[PDB]
Design a protein around this ligand. Structure first.
Ligand code: HEM
Length: 153
């Protein structure tokens, strides 16, 4: 679990991300779709995007970007009791979109990759440590509802 002090740095650096939701939303995705071209093939609305130029112009991504990073916001505030924000996401993620838990790893890798970029003196080590927990945790709760519907895979 995250201790009081552990959620506090998380909730802290996310208070910063709050500041600007969509540009953040931006990079993260470009960092999924770059490092793991496999992810891209999931998004039926985004695969025309060959290059990374194409991929920053496109305004339909940005606003997917906020969509995603809102869903993550709410889950976080609910620190550690989020088991009611999660259920919609776990459901469609398995059944509609047919996503691997391992792409929820790739994504989780890309987030942190980018709050080290856009967030020094709060996203140092100790923040990076709790942050990775609380996503670690995000996927465990996700992964376990997957088992349930039978897509631990
Ligand atoms: C922090 C990770 C993620 C979160 C919170 C997230 C959140 C959501 C939200 C709220 C939407 C719209 C509502 C819905 O369709 O259920 C969405 C759509 C979708 N998610 Fe995610 N998603 C996540 C991770 C992933 C991962 C990494 C992939 C792919 C490798 C993925 C692929 C999809 C797909 C393809 C859609 C359908 C897009 C469309 O046609 O509108 N998601 N997800």
């Amino acid at each position: 679990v995250l201790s009081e002090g552990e959620w506090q740095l998380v909730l802290h650096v996310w208070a910063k991300v709050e500041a600007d939701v969509a540009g953040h939303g931006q990079d993260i995705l470009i960092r999924l779709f770059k490092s793991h071209p496999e992810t891209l093939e999931k998004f039926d609305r985004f695969k025309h995007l060959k290059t990374e130029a194409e991929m920053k112009a496109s305004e339909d991504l940005k606003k997917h970007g906020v969509t995603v990073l809102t869903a993550l916001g709410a889950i976080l505030k609910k620190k550690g009791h989020h088991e009611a924000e999660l259920k919609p996401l776990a459901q469609s993620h398995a059944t509609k979109h047919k996503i691997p838990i391992k792409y929820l790893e790739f994504i989780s890798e890309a987030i942190i990759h980018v709050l080290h970029s856009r967030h020094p003196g709060d996203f140092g080590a100790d923040a990076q440590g709790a942050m990775n927990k609380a996503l670690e945790l995000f996927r465990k709760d996700i992964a376990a509802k997957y088992k349930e519907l039978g897509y631990q895979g």
